[PDB]
Design a binder for this molecule. Structure first.
Ligand SMILES: Cc1cc2nc3c(=O)[nH]c(=O)nc-3n(C[C@H](O)[C@H](O)[C@H](O)COP(=O)(O)OP(=O)(O)OC[C@H]3O[C@@H](n4cnc5c(N)ncnc54)[C@H](O)[C@@H]3O)c2cc1C
Ligand SMILES: NC(=O)c1ccc[n+]([C@@H]2O[C@H](COP(=O)([O-])OP(=O)(O)OC[C@H]3O[C@@H](n4cnc5c(N)ncnc54)[C@H](OP(=O)(O)O)[C@@H]3O)[C@@H](O)[C@H]2O)c1
Length: 433
């Protein structure tokens, strides 16, 4: 293996990592500048449910960044360093027969290597499993390969070796049993009960818990000291009878502003190129169904603020979409108000499940082809946010058709027309999977 275990049975508390990603005690003793290595622990001042129905949980959070000196603009992303579910960590410690509160360090056997440890050390197994390791995604084949030796029941050891191998059947079993069944490490330990790996080796094998990104849903012109997040919680039943929970979204959902004690979220801002036009008079066309509406809430807040200040602001159009108006229409109240006040020139919403067939944002775009062409020819900026798997492409193709038709040009010329808009920064995307 790559690291050797050094147990610290008599270490001073002040020398022990408790979840910080960078410098020891940086989470507790907060000093700017705040960035990825020194994230700001923002207090959650608001955490509320956005959707009307109960099929899913969509939430709006407001993170207090006052005194952080952090600067941001609508369009930027906010990264958060989440924590795993404490109950899940507890289950892992129990099934492994390990004392999670043991403080230790895993040191690279190669004393010259720049990578001295697998994560911040010294630290306890509980802390590592909570803040530093990924214990929810399907383990890679290499992890299964190393774990097989620890399964004392021959049949289970054979199963693990098979799924970690390159045999035809082995690959199909891994695909269905680990990947498709979404079996995380605890699920594997439960389904192969003879598997008893030492916790320190397990901590060396698992991947690191990663920062998760969200599109800031506020304008710094309106909320300079608060960063807002709009997110859908990930929670589903697996094909193995278990309930899997997305790490960051369930961690955020549990952040109660609230005995007192503020709910803190370690975060940092990652600058993007997704930006409103330099001139407020320039029109904007925003397309963002579902949580893709996130950055546009900030855009609209900003355009509304500018109008309120007394500045001239161009047309501001939003093409939003949800399943049902009484199920998951995000920011329905806020958007209605912005429209009523004139901040939002047009509020076009596609309710995809209110009829037998699908009605999506691109259907509304095409039906508004005339005005959209007028706006585009006039210098308007187009923005698309949300699903990158199909929505983004479908929307792009719709703009191709609009330009080809009303622009009286061939598809090829339409593609070049849109591509030039992208190079000129007039067609921007903020999509994810
Ligand atoms: C630049 C950028 C901006 C983003 N902005 C936003 C935003 O504004 N709002 C927002 O809500 N999200 C946003 N996301 C998505 C966000 O970063 C997270 O991926 C999402 O919140 C899920 O994280 P999690 O920690 O809860 O899930 P994780 O624990 O990371 O788990 C996610 C994984 O679970 C699996 N999964 C999810 N649902 C199912 C299912 N039904 N069945 C089987 N497997 C499933 C997939 O393999 C998925 O990759 C953005 C992503 C990027 C890259
Ligand atoms: O946030 P979230 O991810 O959870 O969003 P989401 O609820 O999965 O989807 C947001 C909206 O996008 C619609 N949609 C799905 N596929 C689409 C496509 N190819 N083009 C345009 N709109 C599409 C959805 O309709 P459906 O879910 O009804 O297909 C829904 O109304």
């Amino acid at each position: 293996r790559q690291y050797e275990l050094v147990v610290h049975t008599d270490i001073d508390a002040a020398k022990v990592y408790m979840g910080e990603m960078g410098r020891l005690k940086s989470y507790e003793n907060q000093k700017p500048p705040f960035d990825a290595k020194n994230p700001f622990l923002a207090a959650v001042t608001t955490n509320r449910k956005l959707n009307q129905g109960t099929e899913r949980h969509l939430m709006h959070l407001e993170l207090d960044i006052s005194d952080s000196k952090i600067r941001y603009e609508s369009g930027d992303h906010v990264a958060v360093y989440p924590a795993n579910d404490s109950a899940l960590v507890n289950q892992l410690g129990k099934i492994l027969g390990a004392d999670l509160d043991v403080v230790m360090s895993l040191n690279n056997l190669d004393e010259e290597s720049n990578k001295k440890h697998p994560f911040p050390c010294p630290t306890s197994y509980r802390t590592a499993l909570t803040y530093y390791l990924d214990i929810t995604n399907p383990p890679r084949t290499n992890v299964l390969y190393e774990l097989a030796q620890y399964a004392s029941e021959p049949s289970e050891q054979e199963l693990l070796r098979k799924m970690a191998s390159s045999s035809g059947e082995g690959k199909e079993l891994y695909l269905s049993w680990v990947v498709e069944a979404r079996r995380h490490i605890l699920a594997i330990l439960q389904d192969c009960p003879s598997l008893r790996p030492p916790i320190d080796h397990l901590c060396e094998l698992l991947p690191r818990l990663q920062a998760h990104y969200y599109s800031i849903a506020s304008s710094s012109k309106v909320h300079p000291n608060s960063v807002h997040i709009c997110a859908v919680v990930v929670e589903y039943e697996t094909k193995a009878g278990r309930i899997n929970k997305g790490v960051a979204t369930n961690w955020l959902r549990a952040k109660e502003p609230v005995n007192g004690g503020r709910a803190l979220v370690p975060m940092f801002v990652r600058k993007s190129q997704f930006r409103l036009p330099f001139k407020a008079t320039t029109p904007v066309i925003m397309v963002g169904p579902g949580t893709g509406v996130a950055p546009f809430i900030g855009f609209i807040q900003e355009r509304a603020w500018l109008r309120q200040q007394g500045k001239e602001v161009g047309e501001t159009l939003l093409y939003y979409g949800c399943r049902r108006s009484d199920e998951d229409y995000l920011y329905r109240e806020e958007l209605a108000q912005f429209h009523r006040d004139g901040a939002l020139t047009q509020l076009n919403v596609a309710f995809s499940r209110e009829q037998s067939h699908k009605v999506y944002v691109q259907h509304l775009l095409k039906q508004d082809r005339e005005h959209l062409w007028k706006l585009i020819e006039g210098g308007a900026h187009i923005y698309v946010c949300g699903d990158a798997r199909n929505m983004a492409r479908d929307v792009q193709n719709t703009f191709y058709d609009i330009v080809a038709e009303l622009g009286a040009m061939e598809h090829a010329q339409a593609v070049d027309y849109i591509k030039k808009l992208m190079t000129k920064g007039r067609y921007s995307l903020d999509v994810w999977s």
